[PDB]
């Protein structure tokens, strides 16, 4: 219900990428889905996938292996773990909500900037 | 994949004119469209799901109109708060996609 | 009408290594064991057999044989080829529209049958049934006088026959020889194989013919066999039937004993008298005509098997009607929708399998009757489709649709109606041209079966109820455009669910409150990978008639290149 | 030992009139046309035949026939009974250890064995297999001296044979002929049926008897035959088979005329007169079934298209299903993938369950023989028959099927839900095999009780809980549904998985269901098919399908044990 | 919304029966399935049948053939016809709304009683 | 059918009081389940809906509990105005079956 992005504002190419969104108002092994959404410059909005309440996950199949969400229900996080950097793939990235029953993206977060280069 | 497409990548229009907006779909998307707003330097912001319903917080100057593959977003009597990047959204099949925006403008 | 033949030699390992002799009106033979190429010669004369593995020459009154002396000659087989259904004046009346030309009227060929049944003793048999598992059936005699029937039709000068009385009582056996002796009175050549006959069946033969391993042991007239044994060094003691005596001798040395008649007169003679001598029929239309009238009169006089499936899938649309009575727009009706559509394809997919057992069955035939010049493959290709399997496949669905369409509460508008019975036929018919291109040239009918059974269990699970067509990988998703079923099913489910609510209360139609619920048609169909345009109902029916035309196309060129020999 | 018969007259039309004669130490015969009562004749002399025809009287030494005479004697078949698949050793081996007692030692029945196959020339073909249509086989002559070498073992003093000859070439068949009367100069009564023989086998003779329509025309030494025939009023013609003589007469080249000649003849007043003057388990039951079972076993291996082919089969549909299938989601799809792949696996099972019918029916006629010849009980049979063949090759495909599938599919990750998922398996299996052993056991036709098991496989499946959802069926016809095993496989199997299962990302209708049209969780889908959520409706199919495996065994041992044996 | 029914207060035995609801606030073509209960005296409260929005209509089993509902959309209504009345069949009579997506009754009307005597 | 079973006909408390009543199944209602509470000569009034949801209209004193075939409602502090009858409802099948009523009174 409220969100806050975190991580790395650079990345060296081919190493790895970790990000961080806590959640406050809500727990995420409750009620919903929670995404990692990313908007490159030239806007262009991709998906990317997400980690449901059970644990369960789904990922962008354009994203062949490179990714993987996680959560620590301790403190309400949920992760972000992109491997294989490219300098392709700088973009602002932002975590958003999912509830299911009506099917859209209703909360998200502020959004913060990635960038690959050396 | 399900591939959305939007004709207009641009538009350009003044205060009070009525502007309208589409989203054309690869396949049949049985009104599981949305429509997202979106300010420079602001996360997108829901406006329209199901492609007709309104989310509170707007006013009833937006509209969505659409059936099977076609899709139509209507702002009647435009303001100026109502200019930035709109872009369509479905959420029928997992690999969720957007359109690839929409800028207005003003003359 | 003299045949004679010099050094033959037959190779595919030699059936026969070197063979001279001639055969002139009469009652001529052929004996020896049974490997003993009696059968392999009998055929080579009667041009039965591949001339490229031929080594020799065969003359008759001193002329090579043409290229139509099959069609002239006559062959008669062990196996009566007889159709049981039909009249012994049926089949001769076949025989004669065939094999004879079409100018002559119909009255000079009833007189020719008539004829040929005074002189083999068939009068009170005419009309009598031949007999089949399900029919009352006459003699083996009557049997075998019809079959010969058959081949005078065209007046004969020459004549072959295969083991006429093996198969047979030693009376009717008897009977039979006396038949042809009579005949060959009248100026007919005669020629056939026998295995271990007896002494009045040896007294009757005018000429003889021994073979074992491909060698002639002897060759000439009959009586002079004993005693050109007995000068060769061997004894037959009374009550000992000559040609046991051979047959004993023959067992326990082969080339000792055609050294020996190489060394007799007879083979001088016989070198002699060689050495002195060397120096379509009818229209298409008329044979498409009379295989369909054949075919029809066959199936009628079978009802078994044909009411049996009537009245069996009359029985199935009364259970499905009354399990599946009164389909409700609830959460269930879906699912019983989808299963009872399931249900009619995939049975009409499996009940196709006795189309197998059409050209599998009548293969002899067949083949006896094209190398004879009755027809060509063409038409007995179609005449055999349009008669059987046209009626009792497009019958069964009239009736499925008929009884259950109403009962269970499916779209009541005569579109839908016939577009289901129009699905449900075409399924039938493209299972059933599968099946006749897996079995056409071909004698086994279990590995056929398996094979439809196999094909078909394959198809189910790509037909688009037990598992999801998007969800497949696209590596193995280019699968499902071989099913038969996926196509009937997807017309089936386009032309029902298109105009269904199935949540009381709820409107997902104009606008889904909840993302899960799939509470219309549209929404199943779409889950389904399913088109809503018409054009994805009847891209599914265009599928079909390309399937049945390939599969029709491959069977017709499968009995094409068939050997016939 | 001396075989006398006495006004013998069976009916069932009668197939014998009324028949005199005795038969002595030698090559007794008995010939005629196919309806002769020649076969009915050796049959009624064997024993092999239902008492309550009959109508006359058996004697042997001036003693009628005991009870026991059946397993004493030797009867030898037309068609051989000898498993292809063993060597002759093995065979002689199986006929020993179950006719002869169990109290003599191994040694002694090898010994036994040895000087039958030095008996019939079988030295050099001892441990070479009898053949098969997979198998290379030896000669009709060899099947046959096996196949009387059966009978032997246990020393018969008087030994039948049911055309001999019959199915073999010239040669084979006089050296048969020869050795039987190798056999009879060692003190042993022979008695045989042949079809129109050859001079050399009518000379062999020792005594011949004749018959047509069930009346004796004959009977006497063979060679008088053709005196008495001559001075009947009839004339054979030089090269002419006596036999093939004898049956032009009866043709007609008329038999009450030949009946009442021989009746006024000399050779019927010394019969009747001779006649007057004569007038004035072995084994325990573990026993076979161990050597049932092994048998058994023995064909199996030495038939390794069938069972080879069926796993190898089963593997590649594993594959198959597992590449389909591969990686179920936990979304709207994911109920439909389930139902549908559960569905296929219990029906597969099912269909996969005919072959079971080819088991009893093959083997009909072996089993008549040996029972009647008293080599074990019913019990044995079925009991070994069942536990060599049905049971392994039932019991890994189910395995196999499970081990593959199960995670590539990506079904509950439990070894209790594996366990039961393959134990599910196998009881169906298990049952559908017992169903098609009961349709199938006391017949001789494949295509009949291969029809019946598809048909009513077919309406099974109906009621399964797939196509249509058994809630809706009506009240009257509902109750059908307890007669269907796919039906109590496919349920458990669904407890079993969807038990613990969400459909739908981003939503709680465990907890509270927020629109009434969703589901989204497994309960809901297993109460919308009309499933307990209960341990107890887990189980009570699996008990229910054992209650249906104990019904069919015992209605298929019923049908073996009120068959016909004669 | 807004129901209100209306009918015979009287019936005589064995002869029929028919009722009728008029709704104001919303069209019965529109969204709601429209039921029809009746409540004992010694309450006990069964439930009748509804006709859905599009025409269809579903029944009570313990109800064989003696019921039939039927609407008039021209001035939104729907009516009850109960045929083949007896003493036991009186009771206080209802027009409901059913949603669908939330499965609970939530709009009822005043009710009107119903008499079976002579 | 499923037929629903409320063992307390009656009951007599207080104000101030904490009532319980309890709703019993013959089969699985997976929260399926409302309660509706009728007024002398008066219409029933829904208050209950999925067995813990709550209508506007009402105070939070009413909760709903219960998994399976057993549910309960829970009167927390009841005052004057709660005084009436009961009953259990189930939209699960077609055939929906009501209570038998549960009327409570005051001591
Ligand atoms: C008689 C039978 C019900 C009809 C039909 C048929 N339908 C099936 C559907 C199946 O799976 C489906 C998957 C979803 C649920 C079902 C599996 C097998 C079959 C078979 C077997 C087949 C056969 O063996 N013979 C032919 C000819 C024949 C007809 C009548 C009497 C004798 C022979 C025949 O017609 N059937
Ligand atoms: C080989 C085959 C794929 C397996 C199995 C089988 N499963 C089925 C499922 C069916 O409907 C289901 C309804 C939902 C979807 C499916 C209909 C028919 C069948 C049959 C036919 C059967 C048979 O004919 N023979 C045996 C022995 C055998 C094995 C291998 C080679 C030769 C013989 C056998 O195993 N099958
Ligand atoms: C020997 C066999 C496998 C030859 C190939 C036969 C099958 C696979 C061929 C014959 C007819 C073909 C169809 C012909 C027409 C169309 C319509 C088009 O809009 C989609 C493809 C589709 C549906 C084709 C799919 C492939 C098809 C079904
Ligand atoms: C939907 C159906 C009717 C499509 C058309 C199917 C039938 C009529 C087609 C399919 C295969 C075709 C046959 C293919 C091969 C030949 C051989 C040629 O020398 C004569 C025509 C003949 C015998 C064709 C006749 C027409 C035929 C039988
Ligand atoms: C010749 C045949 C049809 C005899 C009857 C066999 C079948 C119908 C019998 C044998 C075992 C029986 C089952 C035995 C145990 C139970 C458990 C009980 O809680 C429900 C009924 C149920 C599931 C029975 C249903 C009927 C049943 C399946
Ligand atoms: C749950 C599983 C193992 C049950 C399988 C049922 C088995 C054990 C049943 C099926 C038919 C039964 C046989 C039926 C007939 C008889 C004859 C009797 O005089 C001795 C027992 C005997 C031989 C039975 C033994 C047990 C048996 C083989």
Redesign the interface.
């Known amino acids: 219900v409220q969100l806050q992005e975190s991580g790395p504002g650079l990345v060296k190419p081919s190493q790895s990428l970790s990000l961080t969104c806590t959640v406050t108002g809500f727990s995420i092994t409750?009620?919903?889905?929670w995404n990692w959404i990313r908007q490159f410059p030239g806007?262009?909005?991709?998906?990317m996938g997400?980690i449901?309440?059970?644990g369960?996950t789904?990922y962008?199949?354009?994203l062949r292996g490179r990714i993987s969400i996680t959560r620590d229900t301790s403190k309400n996080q949920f992760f972000l773990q992109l491997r294989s950097v490219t300098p392709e793939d700088t973009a602002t990235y932002?975590c958003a909500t999912?509830?299911?029953?009506?099917?859209?993206?209703?909360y998200?977060?502020?959004?913060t900037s990635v960038t690959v280069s050396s | 994949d399900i591939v959305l497409t939007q004709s207009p990548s641009s538009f350009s229009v003044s205060l009070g004119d009525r502007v309208t907006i589409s989203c054309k779909a690869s396949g049949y998307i049985l009104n599981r469209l949305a429509w997202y707003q979106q300010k420079p330097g602001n996360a997108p912001r829901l406006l329209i799901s199901g492609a007709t319903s309104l989310e509170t917080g707007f006013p009833s100057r937006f509209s969505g109109t659409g059936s099977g593959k076609d899709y139509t977003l209507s702002i009647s009597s435009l303001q100026t708060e109502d200019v930035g990047t709109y872009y369509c959204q479905q959420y029928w099949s997992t690999p969720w996609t957007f359109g690839g925006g929409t800028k207005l403008e003003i003359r | 009408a003299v045949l004679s033949f010099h050094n033959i030699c037959y190779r595919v390992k030699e059936i026969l290594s070197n063979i001279n002799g001639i055969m002139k009106p009469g009652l001529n033979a052929i004996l020896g064991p049974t490997g003993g190429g009696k059968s392999s010669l009998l055929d080579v004369l009667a041009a039965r057999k591949d001339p490229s593995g031929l080594s020799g020459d065969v003359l008759i009154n001193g002329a090579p044989r043409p290229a139509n002396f099959k069609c002239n000659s006559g062959y008669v087989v062990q196996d009566d080829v007889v159709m049981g259904t039909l009249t012994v004046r049926e089949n001769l009346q076949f025989s004669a529209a065939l094999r004879l030309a079409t100018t002559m009227t119909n009255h000079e060929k009833n007189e020719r049958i008539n004829r040929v049944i005074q002189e083999l003793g068939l009068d009170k048999v005419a009309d009598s049934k031949v007999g089949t598992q399900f029919i009352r059936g006459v003699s083996g005699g009557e049997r075998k006088r019809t079959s010969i029937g058959m081949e005078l039709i065209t007046d004969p000068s020459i004549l072959f026959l295969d083991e006429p009385t093996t198969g047979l009582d030693s009376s009717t056996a008897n009977a039979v020889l006396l038949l042809l002796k009579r005949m060959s009175k009248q100026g007919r050549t005669i020629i056939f194989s026998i295995h271990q006959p007896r002494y009045s069946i040896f007294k009757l033969f005018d000429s003889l013919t021994l073979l074992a391993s491909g060698r002639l042991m002897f060759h000439g007239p009959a009586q002079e066999a004993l005693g050109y044994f007995e000068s060769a060094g061997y004894h037959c003691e009374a009550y000992n039937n000559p040609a046991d005596f051979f047959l004993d001798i023959i067992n326990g040395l082969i080339e000792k004993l055609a050294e020996i008649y190489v060394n007799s007169s007879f083979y001088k003679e016989t070198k002699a008298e060689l050495h002195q001598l060397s120096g379509y029929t009818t229209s298409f239309c008329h044979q498409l005509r009379w295989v369909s009238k054949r075919s029809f009169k066959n199936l009628l006089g079978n009802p078994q098997a044909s009411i049996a499936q009537i009245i069996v899938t009359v029985v199935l649309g009364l259970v499905i009607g009354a399990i599946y009575f009164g389909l409700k727009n609830d959460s269930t009706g879906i699912q019983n929708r989808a299963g009872v559509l399931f249900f009619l394809t995939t049975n009409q997919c499996f009940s196709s399998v006795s189309a197998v057992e059409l050209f599998v069955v009548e293969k002899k035939l067949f083949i006896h009757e094209y190398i004879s010049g009755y027809y060509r493959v063409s038409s007995y290709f179609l005449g055999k489709l349009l008669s059987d399997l046209l009626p009792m496949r497009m019958l069964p669905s009239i009736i499925f649709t008929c009884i259950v369409y109403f009962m269970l509460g499916l779209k009541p508008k005569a579109d839908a109606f016939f577009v289901m019975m129009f699905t449900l036929m075409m399924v039938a018919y493209s299972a059933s041209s599968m099946a006749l291109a897996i079995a056409a040239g071909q004698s086994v009918v279990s590995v056929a079966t398996l094979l439809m059974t196999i094909c078909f269990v394959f198809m189910m699970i790509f037909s688009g109820l037990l598992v999801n067509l998007t969800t497949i990988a696209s590596w193995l998703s280019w699968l499902q455009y071989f099913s038969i079923p996926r196509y009937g099913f997807t017309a089936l489910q386009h032309n029902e669910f298109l105009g269904q609510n199935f949540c009381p209360g709820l409107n997902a139609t104009g606008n889904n409150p909840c993302n899960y619920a799939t509470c219309t048609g549209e929404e199943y169909l779409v889950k389904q990978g399913i088109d809503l345009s018409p054009w994805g109902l009847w891209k599914n029916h265009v599928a079909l008639a390309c399937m049945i035309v390939i599969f029709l196309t491959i069977a017709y060129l499968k009995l094409l290149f068939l050997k016939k020999y």
Chains 1, 5 share one sequence.
């Open positions: 409750s009620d919903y889905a806007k262009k909005l991709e998906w997400y449901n309440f059970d369960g789904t962008n199949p354009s932002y999912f509830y299911g029953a009506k099917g859209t993206l209703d998200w977060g502020q959004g």
